[PDB]
Ligand binder design. Structure first.
Ligand SMILES: CC(C)CCC[C@@H](C)[C@H]1CC[C@H]2[C@@H]3CC=C4C[C@@H](OC(=O)CCC(=O)O)CC[C@]4(C)[C@H]3CC[C@]12C
Ligand SMILES: FC(F)(F)c1ccccc1-c1cc(C(F)(F)F)c2[nH]c(C3=NOC4(CCCCC4)C3)nc2c1
Ligand SMILES: CC(=O)N[C@@H]1[C@@H](O)[C@H](O)[C@@H](CO)O[C@H]1O
Lengths: 47, 52
């Protein structure tokens, strides 16, 4: 019953969460993680 | 159990200074309880609902 009821309002919430995740990833260094640490060094040199 | 891997048996559990098992039941038993509850019951019923 719950699955039948809450289906229509599920994709909308997922799209909202998708916006959140996509903006989190875009508002990021966009560098592969195993080397991203270098950025944290380099950037902290400038900041 | 086998202390050495010579035999085709599971490795024996670690033992303490005294020759008694070293793991705590109060951690393992709740773990298995939760796992069985989640797998046997909840997940299968959810699958039934989605199939319906
Ligand atoms: C919330 C849901 C998903 C879990 C409920 C299942 C219960 C049956 C579990 C939860 C807590 C568990 C208990 C936590 C601690 C212990 C002590 C344990 O006794 C010992 O082995 C002590 C060892 C020692 O004294 O050295 C026996 C199981 C028991 C009652 C566990 C058995 C099963 C319990 C009651
Ligand atoms: F159908 C289902 F999914 F069961 C479920 C249906 C309805 C409501 C909740 C759940 C659910 C969801 C999750 C989550 F999505 F959050 F993961 C669960 N996770 C766990 C466990 N976590 O770790 C365990 C495995 C690893 C060892 C420790 C125990 C089991 N039980 C869940 C039940
Ligand atoms: C080096 C080694 O593997 N030794 C074991 C020995 O301890 C054991 O008693 C025997 C029987 O399992 O198999 C072998």
């Amino acid at each position: 019953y719950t699955v039948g009821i809450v289906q229509e309002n599920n994709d909308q919430v997922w799209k909202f969460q998708r916006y959140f995740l996509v903006q989190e990833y875009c508002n990021r260094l966009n560098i592969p993680f195993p080397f991203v640490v270098f950025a944290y060094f380099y950037m902290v040199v400038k900041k | 159990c086998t202390f050495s891997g010579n035999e085709s048996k599971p490795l024996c559990v670690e033992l303490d200074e005294h020759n008694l098992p070293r793991f705590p039941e109060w951690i393992t038993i709740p773990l298995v309880c939760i796992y069985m509850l989640s797998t046997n019951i909840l997940l299968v019923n959810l699958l039934v609902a989605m199939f319906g």
